[PDB]
Amino acid sequence: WTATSGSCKGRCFELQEVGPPDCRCDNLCKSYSSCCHDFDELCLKTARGWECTKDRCGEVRNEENACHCSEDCLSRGDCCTNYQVVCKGESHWVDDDCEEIKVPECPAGFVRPPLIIFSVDGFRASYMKKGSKVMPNIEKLRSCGTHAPYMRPVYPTKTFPNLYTLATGLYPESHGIVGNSMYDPVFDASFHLRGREKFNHRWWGGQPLWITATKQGVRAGTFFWSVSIPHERRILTILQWLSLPDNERPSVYAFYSEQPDFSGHKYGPFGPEMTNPLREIDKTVGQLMDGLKQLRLHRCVNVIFVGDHGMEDVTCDRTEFLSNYLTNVDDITLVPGTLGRIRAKSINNSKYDPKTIIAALTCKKPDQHFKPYMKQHLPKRLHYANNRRIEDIHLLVDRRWHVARKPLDVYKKCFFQGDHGFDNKVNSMQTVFVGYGPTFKYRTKVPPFENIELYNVMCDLLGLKPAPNNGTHGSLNHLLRTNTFRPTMPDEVSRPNYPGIMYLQSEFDLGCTCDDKVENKLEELNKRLHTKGSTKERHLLYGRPAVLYRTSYDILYHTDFESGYSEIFLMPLWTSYTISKQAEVSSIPEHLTNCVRPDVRVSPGFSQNCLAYKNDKQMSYGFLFPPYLSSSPEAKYDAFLVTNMVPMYPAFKRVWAYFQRVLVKKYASERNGVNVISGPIFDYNYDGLRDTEDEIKQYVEGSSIPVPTHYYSIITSCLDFTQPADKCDGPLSVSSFILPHRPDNDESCNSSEDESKWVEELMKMHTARVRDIEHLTGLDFYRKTSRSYSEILTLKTYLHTYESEI
Ligand SMILES: *[C@@H]1O[C@H](CO)[C@@H](O[C@@H]2O[C@H](CO)[C@@H](O[C@@H]3O[C@H](CO[C@H]4O[C@H](CO)[C@@H](O)[C@H](O[C@H]5O[C@H](CO)[C@@H](O)[C@H](O)[C@@H]5O[C@H]5O[C@H](CO)[C@@H](O)[C@H](O)[C@@H]5O)[C@@H]4O)[C@@H](O)[C@H](O[C@H]4O[C@H](CO)[C@@H](O)[C@H](O)[C@@H]4O[C@H]4O[C@H](CO)[C@@H](O)[C@H](O)[C@@H]4O)[C@@H]3O)[C@H](O)[C@H]2NC(C)=O)[C@H](O)[C@H]1NC(C)=O
Ligand SMILES: O=C(OCc1ccc(C(F)(F)F)cc1F)N1CCC2(CC1)CN(C(=O)[C@H]1CCc3[nH]nnc3C1)C2
Ligand SMILES: [Ca+2]
Ligand SMILES: [Ca+2]
Numbered sequence: 001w002t003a004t005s006g007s008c009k010g011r012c013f014e015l016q017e018v019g020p021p022d023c024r025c026d027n028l029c030k031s032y033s034s035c036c037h038d039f040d041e042l043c044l045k046t047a048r049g050w051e052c053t054k055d056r057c058g059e060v061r062n063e064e065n066a067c068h069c070s071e072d073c074l075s076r077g078d079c080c081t082n083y084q085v086v087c088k089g090e091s092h093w094v095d096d097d098c099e100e101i102k103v104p105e106c107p108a109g110f111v112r113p114p115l116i117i118f119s120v121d122g123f124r125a126s127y128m129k130k131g132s133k134v135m136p137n138i139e140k141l142r143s144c145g146t147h148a149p150y151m152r153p154v155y156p157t158k159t160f161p162n163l164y165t166l167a168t169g170l171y172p173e174s175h176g177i178v179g180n181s182m183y184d185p186v187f188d189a190s191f192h193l194r195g196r197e198k199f200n201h202r203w204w205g206g207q208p209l210w211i212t213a214t215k216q217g218v219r220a221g222t223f224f225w226s227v228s229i230p231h232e233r234r235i236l237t238i239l240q241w242l243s244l245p246d247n248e249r250p251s252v253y254a255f256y257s258e259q260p261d262f263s264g265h266k267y268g269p270f271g272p273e274m275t276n277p278l279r280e281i282d283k284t285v286g287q288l289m290d291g292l293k294q295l296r297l298h299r300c301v302n303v304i305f306v307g308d309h310g311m312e313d314v315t316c317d318r319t320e321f322l323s324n325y326l327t328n329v330d331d332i333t334l335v336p337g338t339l340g341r342i343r344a345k346s347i348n349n350s351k352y353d354p355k356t357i358i359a360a361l362t363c364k365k366p367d368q369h370f371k372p373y374m375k376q377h378l379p380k381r382l383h384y385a386n387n388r389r390i391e392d393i394h395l396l397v398d399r400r401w402h403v404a405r406k407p408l409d410v411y412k413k414c415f416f417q418g419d420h421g422f423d424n425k426v427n428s429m430q431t432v433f434v435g436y437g438p439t440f441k442y443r444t445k446v447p448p449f450e451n452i453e454l455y456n457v458m459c460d461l462l463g464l465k466p467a468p469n470n471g472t473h474g475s476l477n478h479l480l481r482t483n484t485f486r487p488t489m490p491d492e493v494s495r496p497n498y499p500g501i502m503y504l505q506s507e508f509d510l511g512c513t514c515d516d517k518v519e520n521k522l523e524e525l526n527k528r529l530h531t532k533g534s535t536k537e538r539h540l541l542y543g544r545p546a547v548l549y550r551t552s553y554d555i556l557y558h559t560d561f562e563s564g565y566s567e568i569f570l571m572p573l574w575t576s577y578t579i580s581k582q583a584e585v586s587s588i589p590e591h592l593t594n595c596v597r598p599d600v601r602v603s604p605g606f607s608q609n610c611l612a613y614k615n616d617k618q619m620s621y622g623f624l625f626p627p628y629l630s631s632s633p634e635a636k637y638d639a640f641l642v643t644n645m646v647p648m649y650p651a652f653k654r655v656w657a658y659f660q661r662v663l664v665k666k667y668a669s670e671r672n673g674v675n676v677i678s679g680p681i682f683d684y685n686y687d688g689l690r691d692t693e694d695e696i697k698q699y700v701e702g703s704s705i706p707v708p709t710h711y712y713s714i715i716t717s718c719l720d721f722t723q724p725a726d727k728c729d730g731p732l733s734v735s736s737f738i739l740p741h742r743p744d745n746d747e748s749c750n751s752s753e754d755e756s757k758w759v760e761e762l763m764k765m766h767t768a769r770v771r772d773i774e775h776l777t778g779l780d781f782y783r784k785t786s787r788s789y790s791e792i793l794t795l796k797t798y799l800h801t802y803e804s805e806i
């Protein structure tokens with residue numbers, strides 16, 4: 001109940017919300033059915049429209065008007081945005097040449113440049129180029145300010161998860177808004193787009209920008225706008241707020257547009273009906289910039305123009321129906337559409353079985369347009385698993401497609417031509433970013449980046465300390481004319497040991513054998529140098545990784561590779577090696593097929609053993625530095641050391657072998673040398689973070705050899721490919737992956753074919769940022785380069801997407 005009998009007189013769009021049952025006048029009262037009786041009359045004036053006509057100039061103030069053309073309007077801060085253009089001979093902001101804004105040019109009393117976030121729903125990245133003729137204001141912002149060719153949204157590429165990620169710098173799995181629709185079993189409650197449950201604070205984790213601001217003494221405009229409040233009134237409310245007295249005036253503001261998402265659903269991303277929504281958004285940007293210029297704020301405010309996701313061509317006839325796969329279609333609940341999430345309809349049913357459901361969905365049709373996953377098997381780059389609201393079973397739907405439960409759901413719930421929510425690497429899902437203002441750079445293009453990074457920058461822009469988030473603070477310093485934050489490298493926690501030869505062959509009882517008993521101060525002084533690290537500058541190009549947690553590990557040097565060997569996990573944490581363009585691939589000699597050799601530098605007690613692999617009928621083994629790429633027959637023996645060995649399901653050895661025997665060489669050939677760092681990852685609780693030893697759910701049978709959940713590689717070379725990887729004088733280029741260590745290849749529908757038809761596509765699907773691998777390993781890479789740390793942070797957040805050009 002609300003006693004809606006108070007008044008909005010002089011309270012229109014008040015910045016503090018009053019507690020029920022007093023009636024409200026803020027921009028969200030409509031959505032709470034709690035506005036005062038007179039809110040529409042006083043606060044939502046529409047009379048005369050939104051623009052000053054020539055005959056309205058100098059007029060007598062008529063308070064019924066939506067905006068004013070009278071002489072006092074500038075002092076009252078409530079002119080129509082085009083006032084000075086029509087009545088005072090000024091030009092529109094879009095017609096002025098752009099002039100670099102070296103320093104904030106603000107009125108007295110402004111302690112900091114205000115930030116305005118202009119967010120647009122469904123603004124696909126290519127609209128910048130393709131709609132450029134009809135968006136002059138937006139195009140001026142873009143070319144005069146700082147812009148990226150595109151910005152990557154988070155998965156699922158839906159509105160709430162993306163707006164709330166923009167606000168928090170967190171993955172949906174951490175902030176809790178894991179979709180536009182959700183069920184929470186601890187609450188036993190549901191969340192929908194329509195309805196009131198979404199207004200309960202318990203859904204919303206993290207700390208969004210407006211709360212960060214408030215707690216640190218920076219005042220915020222109120223980000224959310226009721227759907228009935230028209231865009232023009234949103235702009236005038238913002239501009240009015242900017243005219244408030246210093247002690248009352250907020251420093252951060254948000255504008256939101258439901259366009260062009262709304263029309264894009266109806267007409268598709270490039271429907272002819274789409275030109276108009278784009279003109280209209282541009283007109284609104286015009287009104288803001290005109291309004292700022294009136295207030296002499298146009299060289300003072302930082303403006304961010306940002307989308308939440310793009311839009312794809314999707315129709316009703318491109319729907320896959322679970323009813324064509326499942327017999328038990330009514331024992332399940334499906335969250336449907338551009339992604340699928342499945343749970344049991346009843347908790348009391350014990351005949352429900354996720355595993356058989358997945359099996360019924362796996363590679364069942366030739367052209368199948370979705371792929372089932374257990375959530376922990378999704379690509380790690382999606383960071384989509386560590387939340388009770390994310391169902392164990394997930395379907396990644398092909399772009400341009402939908403998944404529904406039964407055909408009745410589609411014709412009794414074609415209507416639409418456009419949708420979104422797909423994998424966040426998909427081109428059509430990419431959105432936009434432009435920063436314009438004194439704090440952003442002038443006429444600057446920056447590389448594409450992820451929307452998780454913006455919370456940090458908006459904190460910088462406002463002099464705020466960001467709450468703990470998933471951005472990498474400093475990775476976007478290159479967007480800014482002046483930086484508030486200058487990151488330092490994290491301190492190494494554990495220093496390595498440098499073991500020498502301490503053990504005799506006979507101390508080892510590992511069940512391993514090697515036909516290596518084939519026998520000169522020429523080649524014996526040589527090999528001593530290699531074991532002391534004479535070739536370490538070749539194979540370790542950016543310094544050793546730093547270990548950021550407490551553990552016990554050894555650096556091991558070899559002719560062809562260096563490793564950081566964990567006495568705790570009984571395998572390397574990382575193995576580093578350089579393969580030059582000229583390097584040659586050889587095969588494993590017949591006599592050395594099963595060869596595993598004790599490492600006389602490392603105790604039997606801190607070693608793996610071959611017997612456990614023999615007894616474990618499921619688990620085989622592989623090598624982190626590949627024997628195939630040994631530099632000489634003699635160096636090859638090094639590759640067979642028990643300390644280069646890691647556990648591998650036979651199904652996974654098919655992937656690994658192909659990567660090591662074929663792809664490393666291909667990359668070295670195409671990129672002019674590559675440095676490779678490979679290693680194991682353990683993430684049994686799927687939180688994206690390194691497991692401690694006590695979190696490991698699986699060992700090689702009868703041993704303390706823990707089984708990785710994933711294998712990673714980071715493949716670095718010179719951005720200038722004319723320079724060799726081992727002699728690069730400038731910026732680097734990187735691609736990485738985190739491959740799931742799975743006992744089958746069910747994920748790849750063509751895996752019965754040759755590795756050359758499916759392996760590389762699998763690797764591409766599991767592309768990763770170096771930063772993802774840091775979180776998962778507790779390591780810090782690129783410690784010693786000639787590059788600035790900010791540039792390295794940018795490099796670490798890079799993702800190689802394998803999509804074609806936008
Ligand atoms: C992306 O960035 C984020 C932000 O930095 C990273 O997430 C952080 O990771 C930390 C490590 O996992 C985690 O720290 C823990 O905090 C626990 C207290 O957390 C509460 O308070 C904070 C601060 O106000 C708040 O943010 C939290 O909010 C979460 O939970 C509520 C729901 O309850 C949601 O509203 C909200 O959305 C958020 O949910 C997310 O996080 C939780 C985990 O907290 C997930 O389970 C959800 O799925 C969701 O993703 C909380 O309100 C604290 O209790 C932990 O301490 C335990 O473990 C430490 C280890 O040092 C140990 O010393 C303690 O003894 C303690 O153990 C006890 O509990 C154990 C488990 O119950 C039990 O086994 C033991 O026996 C002990 O009794 C821990 O310090 C931090 O909370 C989150 N923050 C956020 C916002 O998510 C994230 O890692 C980054 N991702 C990547 C890939 O890098
Ligand atoms: O005011 C607002 O935005 C907040 C905001 C703005 C900016 C930043 C930040 F970037 F700064 F962080 C963070 C941030 F939470 N809201 C207005 C009301 C809704 C939520 C957003 C509810 N809604 C919808 O349900 C639309 C979904 C999709 C769609 N398409 N067509 N119709 C629709 C309906 C839009
Ligand atoms: Ca949206
Ligand atoms: Ca983990």
Ligand SMILES: [Cl-]
Pocket residue numbers: 156158178179180181335
């Ligand atoms: Cl959803």
Ligand SMILES: [K+]
Pocket residue numbers: 613614615616617618619620
């Ligand atoms: K075996």
Ligand code: NA
Pocket residue numbers: 745746747748749750751752
């Ligand atoms: Na297969």
Ligand SMILES: [Zn+2]
Pocket residue numbers: 122159261262265420
């Ligand atoms: Zn939409």
